[PDB]
Design a protein around this ligand. Structure first.
Ligand SMILES: [Mg+2]
Ligand SMILES: [Mg+2]
Ligand SMILES: [Mg+2]
Ligand SMILES: [Mg+2]
Ligand code: NA
Ligand code: NA
Lengths: 1014, 1014
């Protein structure tokens, strides 16, 4: 009783000792259920011997582990509340979540953690049936506790446990009691294991994964591994099943492994225990290996997730079953051959994304509904791979990826980004035991899953000798999967794959000790033979993914460039509530948390509620499995599928002139994997009306799959066909000292002769303008334009910082000229302005306005940009229209928001969306909603014609600049229109340095665009 | 006080937990002294800041850790005794030492150890001066504690500590007190670390290495590494010195590294702290690297141990010294290039031996006198390398090897030989932390020593993924040394060198999973490129080392065969005392210890008191650095030295006829390393007297070295020169029914006509025989003949077992014929015997005795051996002479004991030694003292002539067989003579299977020898 007390238990402080990562934990193993019936094991029916302890527990919060009363070990505290397990207590409000990227949330003084260490005290009272107590072993499983904990059962201390993302299991046979039992779990927010958990995410704590009780027989299956070997043509396979036992060996004991394809058994093997000779002392008496021969196995892949059911049965020689274990088995082979990663003999092209385990309401607790949602959304957008971002995932995730077909990179829970230098602990042999635990237990838990094709040693922990040791350990224990690791320059001896973070396609980034080469240059470096897959690329923070097409062009052109994982899937935003009780998305620093990294937690392709960003469609288009070439009248369709024939594919093609359909067709796609199919279009229309003929093809899946509905579009492409160039009652000008007035029927135009801008336009007696039409050279800065710069530190190389230093946001227009001339059939208004900042002219705009007798006002704009000023974000016009209309109609690229470096997915057509659809609700507001390549734009009574880019919304660029949260934005009086002749790219290679390519930068000195308003 | 008590401290049972190998231990580092004066640091003068705690401590022994009273933490027990530290308490008699080879001394149930765990309680009361307490850090160092311990200082628990062969250091600053202080050390014999310490040696426990107090400044040198890079010709070298600091960094802090050659400084470097960029977070602020350029460095080797003194000084910018550290630096390079291990660019030939840390009186406590004795004896016998057998050694050993010139293989303390299978724990990731500690701390402690050229991962622990991980870790941390490991077949991915245990030269041993190829066949295996050095070969148990010349012939013939380490240096025998108080050598089971492996602990080339075995001279001759070829009149001398010229070498040559010197000479040896020198002998004598001319050369060192005296013979060789064949009063026979009597003057011969043997010989009236002269076909079995077989289990393939099964020791002679004929000038006695066992004739011996008128009795022996009986151990005669003489004089190979497969070191000559010198006192008695190639033997009045092998002593073969200890042997009435025509080899490849080569086996069916007695 004295040694079970908190005074004795907490005196050693195992959470400040990296030599102690666990006390009384059982060995790691593949997931178990201890079925007592082979048919239930085979059918994956719920097991009576696995009992979930999830539900309502009792919880008390304490500032430090020394504030917890000794009475809590005996009975529940009066001040304790009832909470739901699994959960995070920051999501219940007991303290604040912390978002930090690189800097540790605590003082960096390893292995010591703050004395004020927030402590959660969990209690559960539960009942155990006496049959569990009479015979067998009863263990508790904690699937995840953040970050360290101590365990009591009926007042007796059981074990400690540290690692937060792997299951923790303790034997409870000697502690449980017939009838009512109590569990006491003391959870510490900080431990020595927090130094290895510096991943860029919200810092939360508690029992955030499922807690369960498992009953096993005394003689039990303790471990089993499945391996699949193949011949050269994959027509024959061998399933090797190694089974280990615990308890007393008996001669009558047998293990049978049966393989099942649906309800049909395909192979079976029975043997007594006792393996082959290992060394001079013999072999494993408590192990057995079964070799099941499979002829014409069905191969697992992301395209066809062919799964077998393997049932391992421990039974007596007479036949009585003791315990059954089951796992899903995929027949696939992963290997790197001649510098290429092959799956089933074919080179892989990774269409991957990094995924964190995040929920906007439950924090870091994962449920099956959200996992299935994520997987379906990924596969509907042509992703075939997922990287478990910097920790092992919820166990159900790997099973779901097996069943649905996603390749998985499983990562050890090891990140030390905030260490100086980054390898300070990973080059220290005193932390080798902790890292080795974090790697070995992950491999032991997840080595049977077919979706797992690559092991990862962790993320951003430098390069140390511990990494080399653990890489070699993984290669020895599991040779069937390659190992990757990015720290230390992404090409060290601890990686089988060059996996740079945000390396660019064509630009080298020569950092002093860890250079970031361009991916094409990296491949050809002297002595380099390995394949390159970017572990992180195309940073998706806010309005991002510019230059994605460049990455995918390089991916398809260079063999050893085998793809990458986009960073990342979902924004790690949380839900807060305002004074009115309404929910809003929150990022770093919105909870009062100690030094934070603000909005850098939201880098996802979908919002926290899994609503897609506009960049998701760009990723889908660039990652599509069908490539199209147009030669004259023939469409060539190339299949990028490696294994499957296009047996649920149908190509639809349309020809339109200006969004007016002229021809349409449909052919069934019959193309072999990596094959070609030539498609002859019928005699195509030859219209005589002016316009540009457009050919659009689409791949539509007529039927439903497990992850998609009927009619799912999986690929598309558009081309320009033959163009036909266009070959085809006087406005009255009134002059006053203050204005230029032009009248034509019910239409009036006002030009202020002091500002040199069109102040007002009348239709009848109704004003059309709330703000004058003026040149705009700036945008509300994007996250890529800001890039790590802040008001306190400031990065002078960021685009927003250079624009502010040059005075683009503070530039003042000076009227250089303003003259009106009445032509024979039109009124000509010629204006000139100079935008100057502190005696330096940045831009000159010379404009012409021509109002003809047909009511059309053609505007010609010529803009000069000083070569020594930083390149402007846009050359266009902006105004606030007085009218709010429900629908926005335009002819151009759409229907989603698209930008000059992110418009490949956009198709030219006629689009009609509501005004709300024209605004992208980025949680951090910025410039958004732009539509490029637009020839015609209609909003209410106004039509704009030409070749321009535009965005339309109820928010101004100034409001988007000055507002930090999207729930603090208010619709303004009218509609803000931003029509642009030229727009700068958005970047996306990274979000801490400028990443817009030079060809997407407005670097020409002179620009010209025309525009018609009618 | 409650948490410091034994009830709370011992409740966790950290000695049954392999997850806990230490509590509150400081980091491992190179040896420190914390000099406060640079000159004292340079001159290696004793440091005032390092205080030895060796002396008289207080000791109490307990059956289990739970028997220790709580009062012991406060004051010394009345029952406690005063003992000397360092020591082993088994050597003080508190419990018995255990000798076991493979089987664990405890029940194999990891990680659990017996409840009855013997416990030693050590106490020291000491004083600390207040200057130590005012400022700085005070730490205690335990150089070695077996096997685990807990530490208290003034009643407060400090730390646990497990690993037994590496230093354990604990900070005592917060525990010490001004004035008197008490230390309490509770030492446990068994822990979870005992499973990794299953080395074949005596099992002892206690504080067997030195205990010391170190005072360091608060700002201190925490770690430093020295590295030497070279150019292609080794004319230029760079000394890289990396220094780490602990405490608060200050800008005025400096580190200076100066290199000293004697009293002359050769290089120096000063720098502030702050290393180069390591990664994206920068570099080590608390580290600095100095690069000292050395032109024409003097290179360290075993032949010339050229040493530099490096002084590392932490000091302020103004100049004030804070702390100085010093280490001896050798400039050498070790690398494997094209399958050869090179030192300083030259291929190495390892003349190595395995050495255990053993003392016959102090157990496993090492002192400088015995270390120096061992090193001098090794270098005097042409050893140039030593393998630290299965654990890191006493720190002074590496320094002594640096100063004297021995190559060192440093081995981690990891052996699991008794596990089934052997890799049960080394393939378990739950033991990876313990093994990683045992490897990393050894490397960290010993990485600066120039004598250490090869790292070893341990011994006989199978092959697991932990070995691969730790091999990769060593390769990453210290690339300057290759790593070897023998477990798992000696050629796995965890070794840079193929290092088989007892692989043979020409015979393969194909074991099921771990085949032991012949070393020549191993090199050529498909895909094999690595060098081969036998980590253990030529087992030296008892009368052993037969076939050593075969190993060394292969070593010099095959390039990639680069030598090996003999097993082993010294017998691990202990000293017990009889009833009369006299000391005797004891082996396993002589202390009553639980199942033991008897005399298998004594496999040394020298006795426990470091007295050489006869096999040491054979090793010396086979390992000599000068090879000799004789062509006509010219001696060709080849130097096997790689670096040194023969500048202390002088060749002496002698020509003798029958031990009578005819010519002698002397030439100064002037031969370059790996060079040749032709030596023209003067016109050699051409004697006309019959006999065989013999040329003997010797290499004598005229001067003294650090390890040898003046006149040291280092190499020798003998050849046969021209031979001149020999070209050049009646005994009365009396016949009776019982005897044949021959008389010639005062000489009489008696032949029993019932046994058919010469019963008695008279000179005057004095009997010359105590036992009749009879054929002998057996020997007292050697350790190689016994080979693991015992009366309980019995190995049927052992030579002694086959001889006993065939009945060689129980064979009975049957008289086939006995007839005497008187020739014209002589008496002819013809006898025939058949030795039969259960109706099966094994040997037939037909003899002729011819006594001429000159008193000579020539004996002709013809022996037939049945082809289906096992080959006999010898074909000779044995008798017990009635006379004991002081001197044994013979002309033949000598003067040491030599056998047909161990006679290359023996030289033909005339030898005169006392009768005691003719007996080898092997601790386990056996056949010994044999001298081969003997043409003349004189013992008192008797002369024996012919070509024979003989051994002469006061012990009979039956007595040697029936006696198990050499102190239980008693001299018999007369002298036992064993003259043999033919003798079987002794073997030595291993001592658990038959190892005598077929050409050394008496496999011919018929044998003949002649003999003259006069
Ligand atoms: Mg810990
Ligand atoms: Mg990071
Ligand atoms: Mg332990
Ligand atoms: Mg052994
Ligand atoms: Na590629
Ligand atoms: Na050689």
């Amino acid at each position: 009783m004295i040694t079970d007390s908190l005074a004795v238990v907490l005196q050693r402080r195992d959470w400040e000792n990296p030599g102690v990562t666990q006390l009384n934990r059982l060995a790691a193993h593949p997931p178990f259920a201890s079925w007592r019936n082979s048919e239930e094991a085979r059918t994956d029916r719920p097991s009576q011997q696995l009992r979930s302890l999830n539900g309502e527990w009792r919880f008390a919060w304490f500032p430090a582990p020394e504030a917890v009363p000794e009475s809590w070990l005996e009975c529940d505290l009066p001040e304790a509340d009832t909470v739901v397990v699994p959960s995070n207590w920051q999501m219940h409000g007991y303290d604040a979540p912390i978002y930090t990227n690189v800097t540790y949330p605590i003082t960096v003084n390893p292995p010591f953690v703050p004395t004020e260490n927030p402590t959660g005290c969990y209690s559960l009272t539960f009942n155990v049936d006496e049959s569990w107590l009479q015979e067998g072993q009863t263990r508790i499983i904690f699937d995840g506790v953040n970050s360290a904990f101590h365990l009591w059962c009926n007042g007796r201390w059981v074990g400690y446990g540290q690692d937060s993302r792997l299951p923790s299991e303790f034997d409870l046979s000697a502690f449980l009691r017939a009838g009512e039992n109590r569990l006491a779990v003391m959870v510490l927010r900080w431990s020595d294991g927090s130094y290895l958990e510096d991943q860029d995410m919200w810092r939360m704590s508690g029992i955030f994964r499922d807690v369960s009780l498992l009953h096993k027989p005394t003689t039990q299956i303790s471990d089993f591994h499945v391996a699949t070997r193949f011949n050269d043509d994959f027509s024959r396979a061998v399933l090797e099943a190694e089974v280990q036992m615990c308890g007393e060996l008996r001669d009558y004991l047998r293990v049978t492994v049966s393989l099942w394809q649906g309800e049909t058994q395909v192979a079976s093997g029975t043997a007594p225990f006792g393996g082959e000779i290992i060394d001079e002392r013999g072999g494993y008496a408590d192990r057995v290996t079964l070799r099941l021969n499979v002829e014409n196995p069905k191969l697992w892949s992301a395209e066809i997730p062919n799964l077998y059911r393997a049932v391992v049965e421990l039974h007596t020689a007479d036949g009585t079953l003791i315990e059954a274990e089951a796992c899903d088995v995929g027949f696939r082979e992963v290997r790197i051959e001649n510098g290429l990663l092959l799956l089933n003999g074919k080179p892989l092209l990774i269409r991957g994304v990094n995924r964190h385990e995040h929920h906007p309401l439950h924090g870091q607790v994962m449920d099956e509904q959200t996992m299935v949602q994520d997987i379906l959304l990924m596969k509907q957008n042509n992703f075939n791979a997922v990287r478990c971002s910097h920790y092992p995932n919820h166990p159900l995730w790997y099973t779901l990826c097996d069943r649905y077909g996603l390749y998985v990179v499983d990562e050890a829970n090891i990140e030390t980004h905030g260490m100086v230098p980054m390898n300070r602990l990973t080059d220290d042999p005193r932390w080798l035991p902790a890292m080795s635990e974090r790697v070995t237990r992950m491999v032991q838990r997840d080595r049977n899953h077919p979706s797992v094709i690559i092991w990862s040693l962790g993320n951003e922990s430098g390069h140390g000798a511990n990494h080399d040791a653990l890489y070699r350990w993984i290669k020895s224990v599991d040779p069937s999967r390659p190992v990757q690791y990015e720290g230390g320059g992404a090409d060290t001896t601890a990686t089988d794959i060059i996996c740079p973070m945000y390396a660019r396609v064509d630009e080298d980034q020569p950092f002093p000790a860890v250079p970031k080469w361009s991916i094409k240059k990296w491949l050809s470096l002297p002595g380099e033979t390995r394949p390159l897959i970017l572990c992180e690329y195309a940073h998706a923070m806010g309005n991002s993914l510019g230059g994605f097409a460049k990455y995918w062009q390089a991916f398809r052109q260079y063999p050893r460039l085998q793809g990458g994982f986009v960073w990342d899937w979902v924004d790690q935003s949380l839900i807060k509530y305002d004074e009115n009780g309404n929910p809003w998305s929150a990022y770093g620093g919105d909870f009062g948390d100690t030094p934070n990294d603000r909005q850098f937690c939201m880098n996802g392709l979908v919002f926290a509620d899994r609503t897609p960003h506009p960049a998701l469609t760009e990723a889908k288009h660039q990652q599509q499995f069908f490539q199209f070439r147009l030669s004259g009248q023939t469409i060539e369709v190339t299949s990028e599928y490696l294994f499957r024939h296009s047996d649920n594919e149908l190509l639809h093609w349309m020809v339109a002139l200006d969004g007016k359909p002229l021809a349409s067709g449909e052919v069934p796609l019959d193309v072999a994997p990596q094959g070609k199919q030539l498609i002859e279009l019928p005699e195509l229309p030859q219209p005589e009306s002016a316009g540009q003929l457009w050919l659009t093809v689409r791949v539509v899946q007529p039927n439903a799959t497990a992850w998609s509905e009927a009619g799912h579009i999986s690929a598309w492409q558009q081309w320009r066909l033959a163009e036909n160039l266009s070959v085809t009652a006087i406005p009255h000008l009134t002059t006053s000292e203050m204005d230029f007035c032009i009248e034509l029927g019910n239409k009036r135009w006002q030009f202020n002769r002091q500002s040199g801008f069109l102040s007002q336009m009348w239709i009848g007696d109704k004003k059309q303008l709330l703000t004058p039409l003026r040149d705009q050279f700036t945008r509300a800065p994007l996250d890529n334009d800001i890039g790590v710069s802040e008001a306190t530190r400031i990065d002078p190389n960021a685009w927003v910082e250079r624009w502010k230093a040059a005075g683009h946001y503070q530039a003042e227009a000076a009227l250089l000229q303003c003259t009106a001339d009445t032509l024979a059939d039109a009124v000509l208004i010629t204006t000139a302005h100079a935008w100057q900042h502190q005696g330096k002219t940045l831009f000159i705009s010379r404009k012409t306005y021509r109002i003809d007798g047909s009511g059309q006002m053609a505007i010609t704009v010529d803009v000069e940009v000083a070569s020594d000023t930083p390149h402007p974000a846009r050359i266009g016009l902006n105004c606030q229209l007085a009218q709010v209309a429900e629908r926005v109609n335009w002819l151009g690229l759409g229907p989603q928001e698209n930008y000059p470096d992110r418009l490949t997915a956009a198709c030219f057509d006629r689009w009609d969306l509501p005004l709300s659809d024209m605004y992208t609700p980025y949680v951090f507001p910025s410039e958004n909603g732009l539509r490029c390549g637009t020839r015609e734009l209609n909003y209410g009574p106004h039509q704009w014609r030409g070749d321009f880019q535009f965005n339309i919304s109820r928010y101004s660029q100034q409001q988007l600049m000055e507002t930090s949260h999207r729930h603090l934005l208010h619709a303004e009086e009218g509609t803000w229109l931003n029509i642009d002749g030229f727009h700068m790219g958005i970047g996306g290679d990274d979000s801490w340095s400028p990443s817009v390519s030079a060809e997407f930068q407005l670097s020409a000195g002179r620009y010209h665009y025309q525009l018609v308003w009618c």
